[PDB]
Design a protein around this nucleic acid. Structure first.
Length: 155
RNA sequence: UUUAGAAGGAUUGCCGUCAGGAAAUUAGGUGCGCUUAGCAGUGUACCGCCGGAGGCGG
């Protein structure tokens, strides 16, 4: 349980939500899968529920040191060096808080409205390789201490 | 402890006949609208899945 903090620079024109979506999360999927070892993702300053402001900070949860060095963050999320930062230290942070995946129900055509706008207050968008259908994944923050392919804790 | 305390206004009905408003006109001179700007906010949520209702996968 040490760490590596990747930062989403502000300004830059493009919104940080889009930057999070496109660049980061594909590379992460891949990274996580081949490794398979269930990791996790630290979204510090994850502000409010009315909000959903994921923030400008990304940290990766790992177990061993070679545990996070397992992933070559730098060199991967590298080409994009003007919209994402890669810090260069592995810190053994202990005040971390884990993050969980809620869901929210499908549509009436696919009480629907009751579940709607209860979780709809993060909504990261991922395009699927096989089914070819883009969708939203919702997040949460929780007490569980000691996950899945997406970096979120398994259901 | 109030110029106190009390109270059935009722029934009925044919407004009507006629008519010329009408003639004249000059509204006119002048004029500085105008300096700034990201349609953003995320631009919207897909197929399933068992169950049978209720709950996770990509």
């Amino acid at each position: 349980m040490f760490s590596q903090i990747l930062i989403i620079k502000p300004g830059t024109g493009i919104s940080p939500n889009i930057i999070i979506s496109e660049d980061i999360f594909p590379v992460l999927h891949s990274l996580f899968v081949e490794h398979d070892k269930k990791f996790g993702i630290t979204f510090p300053a994850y502000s409010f529920d009315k909000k959903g402001h994921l923030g400008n900070i990304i940290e990766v949860l790992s177990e061993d040191k070679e545990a996070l060095a397992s992933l070559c963050l730098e060199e991967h999320l590298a080409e994009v060096t003007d919209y994402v930062k890669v810090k260069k230290e592995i810190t053994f942070t202990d005040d971390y808080v884990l993050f969980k995946r809620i869901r929210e129900e499908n549509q009436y055509e696919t009480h629907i409205k009751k579940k709607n706008q209860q979780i709809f207050c993060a909504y990261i968008k991922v395009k699927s390789a096989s089914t070819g259908q883009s969708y939203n994944i919702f997040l949460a923050p929780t007490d569980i201490k000691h996950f899945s392919a997406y970096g979120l804790l398994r259901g």
